[PDB]
Amino acid sequence: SIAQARKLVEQLKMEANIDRIKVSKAAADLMAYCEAHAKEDPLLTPVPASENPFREK
Amino acid sequence: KKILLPEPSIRSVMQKYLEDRGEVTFEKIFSQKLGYLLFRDFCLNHLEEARPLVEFYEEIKKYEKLETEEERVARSREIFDSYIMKELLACSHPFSKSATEHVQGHLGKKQVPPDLFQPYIEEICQNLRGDVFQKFIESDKFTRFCQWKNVELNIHLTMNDFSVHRIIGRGGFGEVYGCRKADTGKMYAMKCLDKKRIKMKQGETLALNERIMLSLVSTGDCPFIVCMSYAFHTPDKLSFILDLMNGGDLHYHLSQHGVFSEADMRFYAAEIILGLEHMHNRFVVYRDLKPANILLDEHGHVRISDLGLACDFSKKKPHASVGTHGYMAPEVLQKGVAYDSSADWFSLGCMLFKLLRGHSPFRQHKTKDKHEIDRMTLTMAVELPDSFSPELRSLLEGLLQRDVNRRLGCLGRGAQEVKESPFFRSLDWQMVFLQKYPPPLIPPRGEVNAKGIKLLDSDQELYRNFPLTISERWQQEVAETVFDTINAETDRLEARKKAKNKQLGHEEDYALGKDCIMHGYMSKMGNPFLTQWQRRYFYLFPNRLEWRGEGEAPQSLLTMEEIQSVEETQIKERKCLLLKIRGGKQFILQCDSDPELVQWKKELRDAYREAQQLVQRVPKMKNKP
Amino acid sequence: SELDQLRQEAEQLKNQIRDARKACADATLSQITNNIDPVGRIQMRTRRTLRGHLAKIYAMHWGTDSRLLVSASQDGKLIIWDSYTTNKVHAIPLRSSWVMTCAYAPSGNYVACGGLDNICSIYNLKTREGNVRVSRELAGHTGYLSCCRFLDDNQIVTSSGDTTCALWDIETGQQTTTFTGHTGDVMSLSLAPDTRLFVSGACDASAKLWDVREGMCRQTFTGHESDINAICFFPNGNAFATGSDDATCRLFDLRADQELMTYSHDNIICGITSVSFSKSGRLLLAGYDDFNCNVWDALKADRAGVLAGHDNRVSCLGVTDDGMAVATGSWDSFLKIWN
Numbered sequence A: 001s002i003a004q005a006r007k008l009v010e011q012l013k014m015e016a017n018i019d020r021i022k023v024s025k026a027a028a029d030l031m032a033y034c035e036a037h038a039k040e041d042p043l044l045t046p047v048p049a050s051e052n053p054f055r056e057k
Numbered sequence B: 001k002k003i004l005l006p007e008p009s010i011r012s013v014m015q016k017y018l019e020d021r022g023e024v025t026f027e028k029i030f031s032q033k034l035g036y037l038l039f040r041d042f043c044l045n046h047l048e049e050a051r052p053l054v055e056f057y058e059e060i061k062k063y064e065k066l067e068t069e070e071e072r073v074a075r076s077r078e079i080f081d082s083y084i085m086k087e088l089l090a091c092s093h094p095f096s097k098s099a100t101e102h103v104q105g106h107l108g109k110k111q112v113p114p115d116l117f118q119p120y121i122e123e124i125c126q127n128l129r130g131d132v133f134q135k136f137i138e139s140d141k142f143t144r145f146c147q148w149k150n151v152e153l154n155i156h157l158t159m160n161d162f163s164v165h166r167i168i169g170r171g172g173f174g175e176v177y178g179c180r181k182a183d184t185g186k187m188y189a190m191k192c193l194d195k196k197r198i199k200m201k202q203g204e205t206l207a208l209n210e211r212i213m214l215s216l217v218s219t220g221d222c223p224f225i226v227c228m229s230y231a232f233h234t235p236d237k238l239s240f241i242l243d244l245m246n247g248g249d250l251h252y253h254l255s256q257h258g259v260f261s262e263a264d265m266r267f268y269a270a271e272i273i274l275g276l277e278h279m280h281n282r283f284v285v286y287r288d289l290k291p292a293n294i295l296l297d298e299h300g301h302v303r304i305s306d307l308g309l310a311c312d313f314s315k316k317k318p319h320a321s322v323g324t325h326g327y328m329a330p331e332v333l334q335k336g337v338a339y340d341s342s343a344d345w346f347s348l349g350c351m352l353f354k355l356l357r358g359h360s361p362f363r364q365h366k367t368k369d370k371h372e373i374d375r376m377t378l379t380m381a382v383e384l385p386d387s388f389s390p391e392l393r394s395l396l397e398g399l400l401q402r403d404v405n406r407r408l409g410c411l412g413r414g415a416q417e418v419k420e421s422p423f424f425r426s427l428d429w430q431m432v433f434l435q436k437y438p439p440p441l442i443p444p445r446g447e448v449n450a451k452g453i454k455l456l457d458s459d460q461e462l463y464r465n466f467p468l469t470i471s472e473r474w475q476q477e478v479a480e481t482v483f484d485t486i487n488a489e490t491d492r493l494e495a496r497k498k499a500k501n502k503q504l505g506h507e508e509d510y511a512l513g514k515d516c517i518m519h520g521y522m523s524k525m526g527n528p529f530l531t532q533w534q535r536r537y538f539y540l541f542p543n544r545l546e547w548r549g550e551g552e553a554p555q556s557l558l559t560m561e562e563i564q565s566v567e568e569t570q571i572k573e574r575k576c577l578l579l580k581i582r583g584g585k586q587f588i589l590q591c592d593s594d595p596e597l598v599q600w601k602k603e604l605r606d607a608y609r610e611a612q613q614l615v616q617r618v619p620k621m622k623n624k625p
Numbered sequence C: 001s002e003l004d005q006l007r008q009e010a011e012q013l014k015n016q017i018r019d020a021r022k023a024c025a026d027a028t029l030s031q032i033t034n035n036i037d038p039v040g041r042i043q044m045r046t047r048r049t050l051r052g053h054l055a056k057i058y059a060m061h062w063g064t065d066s067r068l069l070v071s072a073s074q075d076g077k078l079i080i081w082d083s084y085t086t087n088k089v090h091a092i093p094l095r096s097s098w099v100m101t102c103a104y105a106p107s108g109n110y111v112a113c114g115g116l117d118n119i120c121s122i123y124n125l126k127t128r129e130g131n132v133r134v135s136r137e138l139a140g141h142t143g144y145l146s147c148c149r150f151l152d153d154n155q156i157v158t159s160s161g162d163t164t165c166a167l168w169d170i171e172t173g174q175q176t177t178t179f180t181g182h183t184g185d186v187m188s189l190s191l192a193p194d195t196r197l198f199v200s201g202a203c204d205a206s207a208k209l210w211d212v213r214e215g216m217c218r219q220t221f222t223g224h225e226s227d228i229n230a231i232c233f234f235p236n237g238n239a240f241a242t243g244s245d246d247a248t249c250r251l252f253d254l255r256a257d258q259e260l261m262t263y264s265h266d267n268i269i270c271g272i273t274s275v276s277f278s279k280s281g282r283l284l285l286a287g288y289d290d291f292n293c294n295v296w297d298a299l300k301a302d303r304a305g306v307l308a309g310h311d312n313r314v315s316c317l318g319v320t321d322d323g324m325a326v327a328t329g330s331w332d333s334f335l336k337i338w339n
C-alpha cells in the first residue's frame, strides 16, 4: 500500500537520475555501426552460391 | 463363438470408466467372483507379504461349508493351530487379543458354528484394504480384470449365441427351449415370448413385471427358484435365460403319478418353503403358488417358476386380488386390504392340500365359478378329512387361518415359524437346502408334459430397457467353464506380442512419461466418402488427439481447439461419435465396446472444453483479430 | 495523505524523465540517415522446409554454429534440426503438452523449454548413452514460462506470465535473482551481447532494461499502445527493437533513453509476433499474424521485402550468428530457411 508506492518513487529516482546522450549522437553511432558491417551482412545482398551453405557448397 | 479378451491397453479406458463409478474399491471388486479370483491370484503368487492372509481366508471359506458338525470340530482344530496361524502371528498380523478370545472360547465349549472364524475374516480384510489392494490395482491382475469387465459390460446376445435343443415347455405366449450358450457351453432354458402375442392378449405389464421380479430374486443362487441369468430380445420376441428344468411340473406329474403321501408331500413343502423365504427376504410376494408353477429337474428336485405375478412390498405394500382362484388368501381377495408375504403362507396351504387330496381346499364340487371358491375361502373355515395326521393338521390349520394375525409365518419370524411346525420335526433344514433328501418322483428323460398378427412400432419402445445381464451369474458361468483356460492362452498371446515388440522395438512407451489422458483403439472415418473405416490407436492429450497405425508412432492428430463439439450419431445400426471440426469438416469414431463409447465421449468433451477455455487466456496462444 | 504525496512525487519524477528525454531529442534517426542509400528490394528464397512437427510451432532458437536449431510445438515436442540437411538430430517428447518457448545453450550441450506448466526444463544433449533426458526442472514461477535464454550452462534467464523474470542457478535449481517491475505478463526477453544486461517486453505495453548482476530495473521504455510480443537487441547492444499487437515495431536506444523510430504501414494491421536483426543491424525482420515476414530497413524505416511462404501465423523467427539465413516458424507446422 504505502511501502509499495514508496518503493515506486524510489525506483523512478534511479531511472530519472541517469546520463543521457543526444539522439543525434546515438543515431550516428547506429548508422556508423551498420556502415562498418554492411559487407559482412549476407542478408543485405545475396552472396555467391559457393559461399552459401544452403546453396551449392 | 469363442470369448476373446481385449488387449491390455483396454485398461486405460476401462479403469477410468470404473473409477468414475466408484467401482474401483476393495469392497466392490473383492465381492465379485472374477474380481476375487484375480485378486487371490495376485496375493498368492505375487505379493508374498499378503499370501498368508489369503491362505487363511480360503481355509475359513472351506471350513464354512463343512456340513457335519463333526467335520467342523475336526477342522477348527487343524485350522486354529495350523502353520497359517503361526505364520500370520509370526509376521506382522497377529489377530487381536479380543478376536482370538472369541474363537478358542467357542473351541473350549466344543461349539463350532460355521461362522466360528468370522471375527478373523473381518480382521483379515481390514488388513487388505490399503497398500495390498493398491499394489493389486498397480498390477497386471487388475489389468486382466479390466479385460474381463470390458467383455461383461459389452454383452449383446442374439439367438445366434445359443444352440437350441428340444422344446421343454409351452404356453399362451411362447415356448421354452433347452439350449447351450456357445460362448461357455453351459446348459440353460430359454423362455421365448412373442411381442406379437403379448399385444394380442394385453400381457405387456406382465412380461415387464416378470423381469423386474426376476432381477430382484436372481441374486444368491437360490436352489429353489428358476432364476434368470440374462434377458434380451430380437425384434419380435422377448427372451429369458433361466435355470434349466427338463422335468415337467407338478400339475402334470400330479395327474400322472396320482396323489402324494404326507411323506412325499413333505419333500416338496420343505423345498418350496425355502424358495419363499428367499423371495420374502427380498420383499417379493409370489402370489401364484400352485403345482403348475413347481418344476422338476432331471433328478426330481423342485423350483418355483414363472415370477410373472410376483410383486415388491419394501415400499408398495401391494394392492388387491391377484393370483389364481382357490389359492388366494383373504387379504389377496379384499381389493381394499394391504398384505405382504402373508399371502404366500396361505397359498402354500392350498398348494400342499391339492397334492394330498387332489383339489384346492375351496373347490370340491369341481366348481369353475370363482365367486364360489372365493366365497368358501373367505367365509367357512377349512375342516381336514380325518385321515390327516395330528402334525399335518397343525400345519395346514396354521397356514390356512383366514386371520393373518394367527397364521404360520405371519407372527413376526416369517418362515422360521413354518420350519418349526412339528410336521417337519424330522427334517434337517440344512440338508434340505443342500438338496440331500431323496426326491419322491424321478422323471424319465423323455417328456412332452402339459395364429394372428398385428404390427409393431411404438410397442418396441416399451422394451428399450428389457435387455439385462445379472453380473453374479455371468461371472459364475465364466468361472466354472472357460475362465482359467482363456486366462492361460490370453497370457501367452500377450507374452509373444511383447517378445515381438522386443526384437522390433526398444521404442515404448508412447503413453508414458507425459500428460496423456487416455489411449486405446477406435475406428476412424474421415471427410468424406473418399475414406472408409480404418482402425487406429488413439492417444488423448490435454490439447490434442493423436492416432497411429501399426509399426509407426503417430503421424496425425487433431487439436482440442479445432474441435467444435462431440455428438453421438447413428450409422449402420451402430452408435458412433461425430466430431465437428472448425473448417466445416467432420470426424467420426466407432469404439469397440459400449463402455469405451461412454468414456471417449466423456473424455473428449472434458478435454476440448477445458482446452479452449484455457487457450483463450493465453496471449501467445489465443486467436487475435 | 502519505499516499497522495507519494503519488504526486511519482508523477513529478515522470515529468523529469519525460522532459529530460525531450531535452536530448535534438534530431531524428530518419534525418541522420537521409544521406545513405536505401537498401533496395530484399528478396529471399526458401532454401529449406523443415518437416516433422504435427501441429502449431510456437518458438525456435538457433544454435551458435548457425546450423542446428531447436523448436517447440503444439504437438508436445522439441525438435532439434540440422538445417543444412533438414535431418532431425533429436525429437524430444515433453512431459507437458503446453510448451510455449525453447532455448539453445551457447555450448550446444543443453536446450530448455516450458509453458503453461510454469516450469523451465533443462535437457542434456550430451548424455552418457546418447539419450536425451530431463536433467532439471526449475520451479518457482507462479505463472507460465514465456521465454528463456541461457547465459551459459549454469545460468538461465526466464520470463513468466506471473509478471516477473528470474535468473536461475541450473545446478542448485534455485532462483538466484528475481526481476520485479512489470505489471503484466512478460512475453519476451533478449540478452545483451555482453550478457551483463537484458531487456523484457510485457503486456503492460512497456519494455524494461535489467541489470543481470544486481536484479535492478535500470531504465523503462514506453510508447507502444498494446502488448509487446517480441524483442531483440541491436547487434552492438546499445539499442533494441520491439514488436507489438499494435501492428508496429519500434527501435529504442539505451544511451538516449527513448524511442528512435517506428516501423509500420497502413496496410499492415495484424500484430507482430517476433523480431530479429540482420548481422550488421541494417535489416529489422519481423514475423506477423498475417502469415508474412516483413523486412524493414532499420535505419530508414522503409519496407525492403516480404517473406511470404506460410499458410498461417508466422509465430517466430531467428537469424543465425553468421547472418547467412533467417528461419521462420509458423502455425502451419513448418519451419523455413530463407536467404
Ligand SMILES: O=c1c2ccc(-c3cn[nH]c3)cc2ncn1Cc1ccccc1
Pocket: B168, B169, B170, B171, B172, B173, B174, B175, B176, B189, B226, B242, B243, B244, B245, B246, B295, B305, B306
Ligand atoms: O411352460 C411354461 C414353462 C416351461 C418351462 C419352464 C422352465 C423354467 N426353467 N426350466 C424350464 C418354465 C415355464 N414357466 C411357465 N410356463 C407356462 C408359460 C408358457 C408360456 C408363457 C408363459 C407361461
